[PDB]
Design a protein around this ligand. Structure first.
Ligand SMILES: Nc1ncnc2c1ncn2[C@@H]1O[C@H](COP(=O)(O)OP(=O)(O)OP(=O)(O)O)[C@@H](O)[C@H]1O
Lengths: 159, 130, 304
């Protein structure tokens, strides 16, 4: 578990970080439930860090996750589902009811700012894909944001 | 003769189950989840009646049955009686279901305890095949 | 039956179902018993379990040649579960199996509504290459054209073109009071939420169907022309084209600022465009050359 936390602050390797939490859960299984229920939050969140929400649903669909299903696993599934649907409004709507589970995140700034910087272009790929020539003022109404930082982020996308 | 031998009753019925029952009734086994036992062992003469009992099982159950004396695997040069165990098992996969006798399995079952000579080594080689 | 059962009592029989599946083989009575719990599972309100136990039923199929006719009447219970939540296409192929019960009938009203029930799901199902050849199997039947609404249904499919959507509602809005058969509209419009979802479904299907001809005929179009063509605001067209572009069924670039919108033409800058176009076109008269050759060769040998 600690190996996972330190690797999350290091951000160097996002792959083995999920491996450490997986093994840790294998240790906490069948003996102590309170540690096992809190161990899934980190593994699934680190899989969201890897921008692979499709595998999250597959992990929570197994027979092992059904016994440990609860209010937290739905908070993991809703972040996976908002990242798959690429909608920040659904993410924020679910962020208020699951904020009790969001506070357990040791660093709330890292994951949320990286996911916001990600979901930015995940909302842009929907508006950009249909047509090449686009005005900035009408397309900024969909994401609901000033045009300044938007153009800054788009130019960044070119870079 | 299967009635003539007298005892031993629980052994008689035991080999009747583990031998005959997987043939006729694989369902009973496949339901419970148990894999059928593929082998068995008999030993005398603490008493005797080995080749009798098992013999009347071969002539009793009938179906397909194969006779083996341990002295036919000698082969002299080139222990290809090993490849006769391979080919023999292939024809047991042809005429399957089949039953295999093994008489005097001590010699073709040896330990290779002390490293020695040639015979023991190639015998152990056919044993590796088995 | 004593306590009428609940979520727990219906779950007690669940774990007992599969105990006798591998224990013994029973032709009829067991099947009747194994479908008994799902009809209580609808009252349990839990669907994810109902689909598991319903997944045990399909491995028992094909059940025909025994009963004949009762188990064909159970499909009416299965379509209830499949039509409920997520799939309109799962009932498509299965309603042709519930159409085999009136085949033995000996019944008119049940059969007459079976035809409409099987014909009206084409709209509710998302378009696919399997749907295309699905509707061709039912088309041309001698019993099917008995329904006058079937000619409207077929008219929208054959060669597309265009039609006013309100005039479509003139034909399909009468079927609520019309009948004879009200059962298809009893499934659609019976639940207000169900009926509304299939209203937006019909809208999505007609606007998606108007698009695929526009995709073959463009070239280009003005944005404002598509609005008056689809009888809706330009904002609604933006929503529609967003879902169509994320479905990547047809590539397009639709510029809102300048009003010029178009589907395709594919870029194909140099290689494949000129390759296929120029060459195959040139080979037309080349491969047809020898064809008309023998035509004149036979004509001149008929008279000489
Ligand atoms: N329970 C028995 N019932 C009838 N006959 C028996 C019984 N046990 C031994 N015999 C007799 O023993 C003779 C040899 O058969 P058996 O298979 O016992 O030899 P064996 O066990 O290989 O002998 P050993 O073990 O001494 O080499 C047979 O003629 C048989 O009549």
């Amino acid at each position: 578990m600690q190996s996972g936390i330190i690797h999350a602050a290091e951000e160097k390797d996002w792959k083995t970080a999920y491996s450490y939490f997986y093994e840790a859960f294998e240790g906490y299984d069948s003996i102590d439930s309170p540690k096992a229920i809190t161990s899934l939050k980190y593994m699934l969140l680190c899989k969201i860090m890897l921008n692979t929400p499709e595998d999250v649903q597959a992990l929570v669909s197994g027979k092992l996750a059904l016994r440990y299903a609860g209010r937290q696993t739905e908070a993991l599934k809703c972040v996976a589902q908002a990242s798959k649907n690429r909608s920040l409004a659904d993410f924020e709507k679910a962020l208020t009811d699951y904020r009790a589970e969001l506070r357990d995140d040791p660093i709330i700034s890292t994951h949320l700012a990286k996911l916001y910087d990600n979901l930015l272009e995940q909302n842009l790929i929907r508006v950009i894909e249909p047509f090449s020539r686009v005005q900035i003022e009408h397309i900024s109404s969909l994401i609901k944001l000033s045009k300044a930082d938007v153009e800054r982020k788009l130019s960044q996308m070119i870079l | 003769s299967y009635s003539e031998i007298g005892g031993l009753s629980e052994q008689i019925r035991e080999l009747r189950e583990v031998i005959e029952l997987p043939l006729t009734n694989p369902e009973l086994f496949q339901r419970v989840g148990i894999i059928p036992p593929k082998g068995c062992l008999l030993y005398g003469p603490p008493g005797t009646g080995k080749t009798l009992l098992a013999r009347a099982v071969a002539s009793q159950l009938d179906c397909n049955f194969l006779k083996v004396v341990s002295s036919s695997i000698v082969d002299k040069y080139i222990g290809e009686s090993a490849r006769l165990i391979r080919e023999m098992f292939n024809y047991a996969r042809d005429h399957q279901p089949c039953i295999i006798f093994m008489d005097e399995i001590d010699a073709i079952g040896g330990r290779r305890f002390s490293e020695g000579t040639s015979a023991d080594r190639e015998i152990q080689r056919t044993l590796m095949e088995l | 039956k004593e306590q009428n059962g609940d979520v727990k009592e219906a779950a007690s029989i669940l774990q007992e179902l599969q105990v006798e599946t591998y224990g013994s083989m029973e032709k009829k009575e067991r099947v009747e018993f194994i479908l008994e719990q799902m009809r209580l599972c609808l009252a349990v309100k839990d669907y994810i379990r109902t689909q598991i136990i319903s997944k045990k039923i399909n491995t028992k199929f094909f059940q025909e040649e025994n009963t004949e006719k009762l188990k064909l009447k159970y499909y009416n219970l299965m379509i209830q579960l499949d039509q409920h939540e997520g799939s309109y296409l799962s009932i498509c192929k299965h309603y042709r199996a519930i159409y085999d019960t009136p085949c033995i009938q000996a019944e008119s009203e049940k059969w007459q509504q079976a035809l409409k029930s099987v014909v009206l799901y084409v709209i509710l199902a998302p378009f696919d290459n399997e749907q295309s050849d699905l509707v061709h199997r039912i088309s041309g039947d001698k019993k099917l054209e008995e329904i006058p609404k079937y000619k409207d249904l077929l008219k929208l499919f054959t060669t597309m073109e265009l039609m006013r959507w309100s005039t479509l509602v003139e034909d399909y809005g009468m079927e609520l009071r019309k009948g004879s058969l009200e059962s298809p509209a009893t499934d659609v419009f019976g639940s207000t939420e169900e009926g509304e979802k299939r209203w937006k479904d019909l809208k999505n299907r007609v606007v998606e169907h108007n698009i695929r001809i526009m995709a073959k005929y463009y070239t280009r179009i003005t944005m404002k022309r598509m609005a008056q063509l689809l009888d809706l605001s330009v904002d609604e067209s933006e929503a529609f084209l967003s879902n169509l572009v994320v479905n990547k069924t047809i590539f397009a670039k639709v510029d809102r600022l300048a009003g010029i919108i178009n589907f395709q033409r594919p870029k194909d800058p140099n290689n494949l465009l000129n390759d296929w176009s120029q060459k195959l076109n040139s080979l037309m008269s080349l491969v047809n050359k020898t064809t008309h050759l023998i035509a004149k060769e036979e004509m001149i040998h008929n008279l000489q």
